[PDB]
């Protein structure tokens, strides 16, 4: 590419892997969003919350695709794997699944940053720091908060817990 | 499900297949969108055009997921297959690929409508007619228009054709 | 902590030390602020200037406390030592004391950044770069400017110097 | 000091002690504020509530420093001791700790007022009455209200109590 | 300098070299801008485009001069060399020359960043990342886009190519 | 050139020399501007004043480049020489240097006008009269005013002089 400069083939490949992972995380969140609008779950603010999470991950996936083009890399898409479950069991189980998902996404981003550093690619390092790493920390912290409150309130077995959390925290 | 009524298991399964197909079509269009923002393609209104196509297909996929929940069906997600190509070759090739994609999506919707009719599900039939069938006809017609003009202008080999089409029709 | 990831115990401890140092710097500046509103000093814009410096350091201390929580560390507070003097002697002496204070704070931040780099913590490195390191450089530069002008004007012994600097530069 | 009049050295010293105590109370409240934004506590309106308490105590400390200067006294700062705990255990425990803290601060203010009266310093007595004594009574009453409601709701062991109090009373 | 801290003499010297290079790039772009307003070239949006490029490089040069002062370095100016050509031959030749110029400027910035990293100067590294490295990537990508479209349209020999590109892309 | 009329080759060459001289004067003023934002000079309105002088000279250089194109001449750029000093010593020394610079620029413009008159080029003569000669007289007069006041105030050795001039005249 006539724009390519200081852009290692390993970084290009790692960006393509991260694109797939952010698309996958978007899909997991979409699955969770529509679990909570089932007639036998019906927690509409959990639904809205995870739909917003899904949009955020889609935006980050697209920004990585833009980055690939900006640097002269070439996007290579792969299948987006279906999520591990269609039935997410409870508000608490979904929040815990989201927390684990984001820590896995965070680990991948940190490994991508370490690669960028190894290859002396400060543009890529800054891109990750500016748009990904602190956003990931904020989301993980928020999910941790939500898990804590749900557990303390007695979710999933206490009948009022997820209902009240849906209407107060996620409202 | 305590909401389920007149909703055949075959229709539920066929809705799950259509959800996957609309997500797949969304992915194809996303792939096309970022092909046109490559530095060696750089047709930004083709890029915008296919990104909009992608959003429309995502909306239709989500509306089918909502429908499944509304009727008491259960969403079952599957892998979203990667598109057939990462390199879409030209503006004309992409428009022709999109036209073929939409005719395939349209055929699936029409088969879904025929199933709904066979199972005496007028709610499902109306849902498809109201939100899917005429939108598909409009999009196919528009893609046909675009293919015709691109071919007549001399795309892909004529150097001004896709450039001028990008700036005039898709601008 | 269920949110903790890639966060080294040394970094957590170093953050707790920096919190104490930023609180201490806030206290020094508060002391300076109220020195200049003594009836036998009465330089109200020096007073306002150092009060603003104090608020800025309090904000940075709180942002480090927020960071500790965001990353799953645990805040451990220590005594905030009283400043070295209650009588800051003159506008020039206070500005020189502030310059030395900020260089000490800056050195601590740079050592914290070097630790973050050693521990492969790019989130922490970026946090320091984004919110602390350039703000410190700007403040040190401004204090250098003020010291230069005060010295050139003949502070502290020239009777008009601090009075005129208070009303023109700090007004 | 050429402004000093009817201002007893004991009152000056007692004002310096009260400044340290109000700064200490500010620090305790800051500690409490950031306890409630831990991922394993996550009661953000408790956090906001105690942060506001902290700002109020900082304002009262500064107003005492202003008073010292207004009367021709000389501010003598001392170390601000760290709070007794970093882990405040629960919303109820923190509210009870705050109530005890404010009664101790109130006792010190009342002793300061008695000193002012003994030394025939009505300006100092009025300053305390106008800006400190009724504000202290209001805050103690409010903390008493909060403690009562938390206890009645079943805090800290009842899972919904602090969550609901956070969102309704402190929201 | 009484403000100088953690600022290596090599970094100071390298900043002075980068200032000259950004001023030089500004001069090249100014030369290109007025080539396109010749009566025998007369592509006024090419002219505007390169004038804007020139202003951007002047701003970056001045920001490096500000940085030198902020850190306590001392600006040392050198001759600004005249550009390689006064006659830039065509819109396509100028865009290709600009692309090569920016890659050379980018290489210098990346080497400056590597120096900052070697000398443990995170303030300088962040300054380059925040204000220079991503701006350079964006400009190189845009120039790549423009070169691609011009080539595909048949520039410089096809009579309509640069005229149409001037009025559509650069308008 | 098909636009060229009554435009002598000597005038074209002399215009190219004046372009270089106005660019050089712009560079001198830029150097002066950033001398006054050194931490050990820190006269920010001197800095602003000379930056404005620099922009004015850049505008006049560009207007001469436009003139060359308007008349069918061909711009030939040369190196822009670095200024005589990086350290401008004082506000007074810089103002005196600027006065000498502008008289040299003025002499060149007057010689250019005499050439235009010799070659019977009234368009060029009017261009110089309308945009250059009275602007030069105004700037020289202003610099003379500033030099006079600085000298009378006791610059550079009197500590208040440049400080007060910076804040009152140049503010
Ligand atoms: Au993601
Ligand atoms: Au997001
Ligand atoms: Au679709
Ligand atoms: Au659509
Ligand atoms: Au601080
Ligand atoms: Au600040
Ligand atoms: Au207090
Ligand atoms: Au208060
Ligand atoms: Au530049
Ligand atoms: Au720029
Ligand atoms: Au000039
Ligand atoms: Au001017």
Coordinates of N, CA and C in Angstrom, one line a residue, chain A residues 13-169:
Chain A
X13 N -2.4 -8.4 11.3 CA -3.1 -9.7 11.6 C -3.8 -9.6 13.0
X14 N -3.1 -9.0 14.0 CA -3.7 -8.9 15.3 C -4.9 -8.0 15.3
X15 N -4.9 -6.9 14.5 CA -6.0 -6.0 14.3 C -7.2 -6.8 13.7
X16 N -6.9 -7.6 12.7 CA -8.0 -8.4 12.2 C -8.6 -9.4 13.2
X17 N -7.8 -10.0 14.1 CA -8.3 -10.8 15.2 C -9.2 -10.0 16.1
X18 N -8.7 -8.8 16.5 CA -9.5 -7.9 17.4 C -10.8 -7.5 16.8
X19 N -10.8 -7.2 15.5 CA -12.1 -6.9 14.9 C -13.1 -8.0 15.1
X20 N -12.7 -9.3 14.8 CA -13.6 -10.4 15.0 C -14.0 -10.5 16.5
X21 N -13.1 -10.3 17.4 CA -13.5 -10.4 18.8 C -14.5 -9.3 19.2
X22 N -14.3 -8.1 18.7 CA -15.2 -7.0 19.1 C -16.6 -7.2 18.5
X23 N -16.6 -7.8 17.2 CA -17.9 -8.2 16.6 C -18.5 -9.3 17.4
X24 N -17.8 -10.3 17.8 CA -18.3 -11.3 18.7 C -18.9 -10.8 20.0
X25 N -18.2 -9.9 20.6 CA -18.7 -9.3 21.9 C -20.0 -8.5 21.6
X26 N -20.1 -7.8 20.5 CA -21.3 -7.2 20.1 C -22.5 -8.2 20.0
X27 N -22.2 -9.4 19.4 CA -23.2 -10.4 19.2 C -23.7 -11.0 20.5
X28 N -22.7 -11.3 21.4 CA -23.1 -11.7 22.8 C -24.0 -10.7 23.5
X29 N -23.7 -9.4 23.4 CA -24.5 -8.4 24.0 C -25.9 -8.3 23.3
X30 N -25.9 -8.5 22.0 CA -27.2 -8.5 21.3 C -28.1 -9.7 21.8
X31 N -27.5 -10.8 21.9 CA -28.2 -12.0 22.5 C -28.7 -11.7 23.9
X32 N -27.9 -11.2 24.7 CA -28.4 -10.8 26.1 C -29.5 -9.8 26.0
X33 N -29.4 -8.8 25.2 CA -30.4 -7.8 25.1 C -31.8 -8.4 24.9
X34 N -31.9 -9.3 23.9 CA -33.2 -9.9 23.6 C -33.6 -11.1 24.5
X35 N -32.7 -11.6 25.3 CA -33.1 -12.5 26.3 C -34.0 -11.7 27.3
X36 N -33.6 -10.5 27.7 CA -34.3 -9.8 28.7 C -35.7 -9.2 28.2
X37 N -36.0 -9.3 26.9 CA -37.3 -8.9 26.5 C -38.2 -10.1 26.2
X38 N -37.8 -11.3 26.5 CA -38.7 -12.5 26.6 C -39.8 -12.2 27.5
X39 N -41.0 -12.8 27.2 CA -42.1 -12.6 28.1 C -41.9 -13.2 29.4
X40 N -41.1 -14.2 29.6 CA -40.8 -14.9 30.8 C -39.5 -14.3 31.5
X41 N -39.1 -13.2 31.1 CA -38.0 -12.5 31.7 C -38.4 -11.0 31.9
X42 N -38.6 -10.3 30.8 CA -39.3 -9.0 30.8 C -38.7 -8.0 31.8
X43 N -37.3 -7.8 31.6 CA -36.6 -6.8 32.3 C -36.1 -5.8 31.3
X44 N -36.9 -4.8 30.9 CA -36.7 -4.0 29.7 C -35.5 -3.1 29.9
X45 N -35.1 -2.7 31.1 CA -33.9 -1.9 31.2 C -32.6 -2.7 31.2
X46 N -32.7 -4.0 31.7 CA -31.6 -4.9 31.3 C -31.4 -5.0 29.8
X47 N -32.6 -5.1 29.1 CA -32.5 -5.2 27.7 C -31.9 -4.0 27.1
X48 N -32.3 -2.8 27.4 CA -31.7 -1.6 26.9 C -30.2 -1.5 27.3
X49 N -29.9 -1.9 28.5 CA -28.5 -1.8 28.9 C -27.6 -2.6 28.1
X50 N -28.0 -3.9 27.8 CA -27.1 -4.7 27.0 C -27.1 -4.4 25.5
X51 N -28.3 -3.8 25.1 CA -28.3 -3.3 23.7 C -27.3 -2.2 23.5
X52 N -27.2 -1.3 24.5 CA -26.2 -0.2 24.5 C -24.8 -0.8 24.5
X53 N -24.5 -1.7 25.4 CA -23.2 -2.4 25.3 C -22.9 -3.0 24.0
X54 N -23.9 -3.6 23.3 CA -23.7 -4.1 22.0 C -23.3 -3.1 21.0
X55 N -24.0 -1.9 21.0 CA -23.7 -0.8 20.1 C -22.3 -0.3 20.3
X56 N -21.9 -0.2 21.6 CA -20.5 0.3 21.9 C -19.5 -0.6 21.3
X57 N -19.7 -2.0 21.3 CA -18.7 -2.9 20.8 C -18.7 -2.9 19.3
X58 N -19.9 -2.7 18.7 CA -19.9 -2.5 17.2 C -19.1 -1.3 16.8
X59 N -19.3 -0.2 17.5 CA -18.5 1.0 17.2 C -17.0 0.8 17.3
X60 N -16.6 0.1 18.3 CA -15.2 -0.2 18.5 C -14.7 -1.1 17.4
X61 N -15.5 -2.1 17.0 CA -15.1 -3.0 15.9 C -14.9 -2.1 14.6
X62 N -15.9 -1.3 14.3 CA -15.7 -0.4 13.1 C -14.5 0.5 13.2
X63 N -14.2 1.0 14.3 CA -13.1 1.9 14.5 C -11.8 1.1 14.2
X64 N -11.7 -0.1 14.6 CA -10.6 -0.9 14.2 C -10.5 -1.2 12.7
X65 N -11.6 -1.4 12.1 CA -11.7 -1.5 10.6 C -11.2 -0.2 10.0
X66 N -11.7 0.9 10.5 CA -11.2 2.2 9.9 C -9.6 2.3 10.1
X67 N -9.1 1.9 11.3 CA -7.7 1.9 11.6 C -6.9 1.1 10.6
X68 N -7.4 -0.1 10.3 CA -6.7 -1.0 9.3 C -6.6 -0.2 8.0
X69 N -7.7 0.4 7.5 CA -7.6 1.1 6.2 C -6.7 2.3 6.4
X70 N -6.8 3.1 7.5 CA -6.0 4.3 7.6 C -4.5 3.9 7.5
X71 N -4.1 2.8 8.1 CA -2.7 2.4 8.1 C -2.2 1.6 6.8
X72 N -3.2 1.3 5.9 CA -2.8 0.5 4.7 C -2.9 -0.9 4.9
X73 N -3.4 -1.4 6.1 CA -3.7 -2.8 6.2 C -4.9 -3.2 5.4
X74 N -5.2 -4.5 5.4 CA -6.3 -5.1 4.7 C -7.2 -5.9 5.6
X75 N -8.4 -5.5 5.7 CA -9.4 -6.1 6.6 C -9.6 -7.5 6.0
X76 N -9.5 -8.5 6.9 CA -9.9 -9.9 6.6 C -10.9 -10.3 7.7
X77 N -12.2 -10.5 7.2 CA -13.2 -10.9 8.1 C -13.3 -12.4 8.3
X78 N -13.8 -12.8 9.4 CA -14.0 -14.2 9.7 C -15.4 -14.4 10.3
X79 N -15.9 -15.6 10.3 CA -17.2 -15.9 10.9 C -17.3 -15.2 12.3
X80 N -18.5 -14.7 12.6 CA -18.7 -14.2 14.0 C -19.4 -15.4 14.7
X81 N -18.7 -15.9 15.7 CA -19.3 -17.1 16.4 C -20.5 -16.8 17.2
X82 N -21.4 -17.7 17.2 CA -22.6 -17.5 18.0 C -22.2 -17.4 19.5
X83 N -23.0 -16.7 20.4 CA -22.7 -16.7 21.8 C -22.8 -18.1 22.4
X84 N -22.2 -18.3 23.6 CA -22.2 -19.5 24.3 C -23.6 -20.0 24.7
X85 N -24.5 -19.1 25.0 CA -25.9 -19.5 25.4 C -26.9 -18.6 24.7
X86 N -28.1 -19.2 24.5 CA -29.2 -18.3 24.1 C -30.0 -17.9 25.3
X87 N -30.0 -18.8 26.4 CA -30.8 -18.6 27.6 C -29.7 -18.1 28.6
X88 N -29.8 -16.8 29.0 CA -28.8 -16.2 29.9 C -29.2 -16.3 31.4
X89 N -30.3 -17.1 31.7 CA -30.6 -17.6 33.0 C -31.1 -16.5 34.0
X90 N -30.4 -15.3 34.1 CA -30.9 -14.3 35.0 C -30.1 -13.0 34.8
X91 N -30.7 -11.9 35.3 CA -29.9 -10.7 35.2 C -28.5 -10.8 35.8
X92 N -28.4 -11.5 37.0 CA -27.0 -11.6 37.6 C -26.1 -12.4 36.7
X93 N -26.6 -13.6 36.2 CA -25.8 -14.4 35.3 C -25.3 -13.7 34.1
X94 N -26.2 -12.9 33.5 CA -25.8 -12.1 32.3 C -24.8 -11.0 32.7
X95 N -24.9 -10.3 33.8 CA -23.9 -9.3 34.2 C -22.6 -10.0 34.5
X96 N -22.6 -11.2 35.1 CA -21.3 -11.9 35.3 C -20.7 -12.4 34.0
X97 N -21.6 -12.8 33.1 CA -21.1 -13.2 31.8 C -20.5 -12.0 31.0
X98 N -21.1 -10.9 31.1 CA -20.6 -9.7 30.5 C -19.2 -9.3 31.1
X99 N -19.1 -9.3 32.4 CA -17.9 -9.0 33.1 C -16.7 -9.9 32.6
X100 N -17.0 -11.2 32.5 CA -16.0 -12.1 32.0 C -15.7 -11.8 30.5
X101 N -16.7 -11.6 29.7 CA -16.5 -11.2 28.3 C -15.6 -10.0 28.2
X102 N -15.8 -8.9 29.0 CA -15.0 -7.7 28.8 C -13.6 -7.9 29.3
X103 N -13.4 -8.7 30.4 CA -12.0 -9.0 30.8 C -11.3 -9.8 29.7
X104 N -12.0 -10.6 29.0 CA -11.3 -11.3 27.9 C -11.0 -10.4 26.7
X105 N -11.9 -9.5 26.4 CA -11.7 -8.5 25.4 C -10.6 -7.6 25.8
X106 N -10.6 -7.2 27.1 CA -9.5 -6.3 27.6 C -8.1 -7.0 27.5
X107 N -8.1 -8.3 27.9 CA -6.8 -9.0 27.8 C -6.3 -9.0 26.3
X108 N -7.2 -9.2 25.4 CA -6.8 -9.2 24.0 C -6.3 -7.8 23.6
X109 N -6.9 -6.7 24.0 CA -6.5 -5.4 23.7 C -5.1 -5.1 24.3
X110 N -4.9 -5.5 25.6 CA -3.6 -5.3 26.2 C -2.5 -6.1 25.5
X111 N -2.8 -7.3 25.0 CA -1.8 -8.1 24.2 C -1.6 -7.4 22.9
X112 N -2.6 -6.8 22.3 CA -2.4 -6.0 21.1 C -1.5 -4.8 21.4
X113 N -1.7 -4.1 22.5 CA -0.9 -3.0 22.9 C 0.6 -3.4 23.1
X114 N 0.8 -4.6 23.7 CA 2.1 -5.1 23.9 C 2.8 -5.4 22.6
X115 N 2.0 -5.9 21.6 CA 2.6 -6.1 20.3 C 3.0 -4.8 19.6
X116 N 2.1 -3.8 19.7 CA 2.4 -2.5 19.1 C 3.7 -2.0 19.7
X117 N 3.8 -2.1 21.0 CA 5.1 -1.6 21.7 C 6.3 -2.4 21.2
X118 N 6.1 -3.7 21.1 CA 7.3 -4.6 20.6 C 7.7 -4.2 19.2
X119 N 6.7 -3.8 18.4 CA 7.0 -3.5 17.0 C 7.3 -2.0 16.8
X120 N 7.4 -1.2 17.9 CA 7.7 0.2 17.8 C 6.6 0.9 17.0
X121 N 5.3 0.7 17.3 CA 4.2 1.3 16.6 C 3.5 2.2 17.6
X122 N 4.0 3.4 17.8 CA 3.3 4.3 18.8 C 2.0 4.8 18.3
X123 N 1.8 4.9 17.0 CA 0.4 5.3 16.5 C -0.6 4.3 16.9
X124 N -0.3 3.0 16.8 CA -1.2 1.9 17.2 C -1.4 1.9 18.7
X125 N -0.3 2.1 19.4 CA -0.4 2.1 20.9 C -1.3 3.2 21.4
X126 N -1.1 4.4 20.8 CA -1.9 5.5 21.2 C -3.4 5.3 20.8
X127 N -3.6 4.7 19.7 CA -5.0 4.5 19.2 C -5.7 3.6 20.3
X128 N -5.1 2.5 20.7 CA -5.6 1.6 21.7 C -5.8 2.4 23.1
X129 N -4.8 3.1 23.5 CA -5.0 3.9 24.8 C -6.1 4.9 24.7
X130 N -6.2 5.6 23.6 CA -7.1 6.7 23.5 C -8.6 6.2 23.4
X131 N -8.8 5.1 22.6 CA -10.2 4.7 22.3 C -10.6 3.4 23.0
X132 N -9.7 2.6 23.5 CA -10.1 1.3 23.9 C -9.8 1.0 25.4
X133 N -8.5 1.3 25.8 CA -8.1 0.8 27.1 C -8.9 1.4 28.3
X134 N -9.1 2.7 28.3 CA -9.8 3.3 29.4 C -11.3 3.1 29.3
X135 N -11.9 3.0 28.0 CA -13.3 2.6 27.9 C -13.5 1.2 28.5
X136 N -12.5 0.3 28.2 CA -12.7 -1.1 28.8 C -12.7 -1.1 30.3
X137 N -11.7 -0.3 30.9 CA -11.7 -0.2 32.4 C -13.0 0.3 32.9
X138 N -13.5 1.4 32.3 CA -14.8 2.0 32.8 C -15.9 0.9 32.7
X139 N -16.0 0.2 31.6 CA -17.1 -0.8 31.5 C -16.9 -1.9 32.5
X140 N -15.7 -2.4 32.7 CA -15.5 -3.5 33.6 C -15.9 -3.0 35.0
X141 N -15.4 -1.8 35.4 CA -15.8 -1.3 36.7 C -17.3 -1.2 36.9
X142 N -18.0 -0.7 35.8 CA -19.5 -0.6 35.9 C -20.1 -2.0 36.1
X143 N -19.7 -2.9 35.3 CA -20.2 -4.3 35.4 C -19.9 -4.9 36.8
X144 N -18.7 -4.6 37.3 CA -18.4 -5.0 38.7 C -19.4 -4.4 39.7
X145 N -19.6 -3.1 39.6 CA -20.6 -2.5 40.5 C -22.0 -3.2 40.4
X146 N -22.4 -3.5 39.2 CA -23.7 -4.0 39.0 C -23.8 -5.4 39.6
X147 N -22.8 -6.3 39.3 CA -22.7 -7.6 39.9 C -22.8 -7.5 41.4
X148 N -22.0 -6.6 42.0 CA -22.0 -6.5 43.5 C -23.4 -6.2 44.0
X149 N -24.0 -5.2 43.4 CA -25.3 -4.8 43.9 C -26.4 -5.9 43.7
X150 N -26.4 -6.6 42.5 CA -27.3 -7.7 42.3 C -27.1 -8.8 43.4
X151 N -25.8 -9.2 43.6 CA -25.5 -10.2 44.6 C -26.0 -9.8 46.0
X152 N -25.7 -8.5 46.4 CA -26.1 -8.1 47.7 C -27.6 -8.1 47.8
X153 N -28.3 -7.6 46.8 CA -29.8 -7.6 46.8 C -30.4 -9.0 46.9
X154 N -29.7 -10.1 46.6 CA -30.2 -11.4 46.6 C -30.5 -12.0 45.3
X155 N -30.1 -11.4 44.2 CA -30.3 -12.0 42.9 C -29.6 -13.3 42.8
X156 N -30.1 -14.3 42.0 CA -31.3 -14.2 41.2 C -32.5 -14.7 41.9
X157 N -32.4 -15.3 43.1 CA -33.5 -16.0 43.7 C -34.5 -15.1 44.4
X158 N -34.0 -13.9 45.0 CA -34.9 -13.0 45.6 C -35.8 -12.3 44.6
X159 N -37.1 -12.4 44.7 CA -38.0 -12.0 43.7 C -38.0 -10.5 43.3
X160 N -37.7 -9.7 44.3 CA -37.6 -8.2 44.1 C -36.3 -7.7 43.5
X161 N -35.2 -8.5 43.6 CA -33.9 -8.0 43.4 C -33.7 -7.5 41.9
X162 N -33.8 -8.4 41.0 CA -33.6 -8.0 39.6 C -34.6 -7.0 39.1
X163 N -35.9 -7.1 39.6 CA -36.9 -6.2 39.2 C -36.5 -4.8 39.7
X164 N -36.1 -4.7 41.0 CA -35.8 -3.3 41.5 C -34.5 -2.8 40.9
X165 N -33.5 -3.7 40.6 CA -32.3 -3.2 40.0 C -32.6 -2.7 38.6
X166 N -33.4 -3.4 37.9 CA -33.8 -3.0 36.5 C -34.4 -1.6 36.6
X167 N -35.3 -1.3 37.5 CA -36.0 -0.1 37.5 C -35.2 1.1 38.1
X168 N -34.3 0.8 39.0 CA -33.6 1.9 39.7 C -32.2 2.1 39.1
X169 N -31.3 1.1 39.1 CA -30.0 1.3 38.5 C -30.1 1.5 37.0

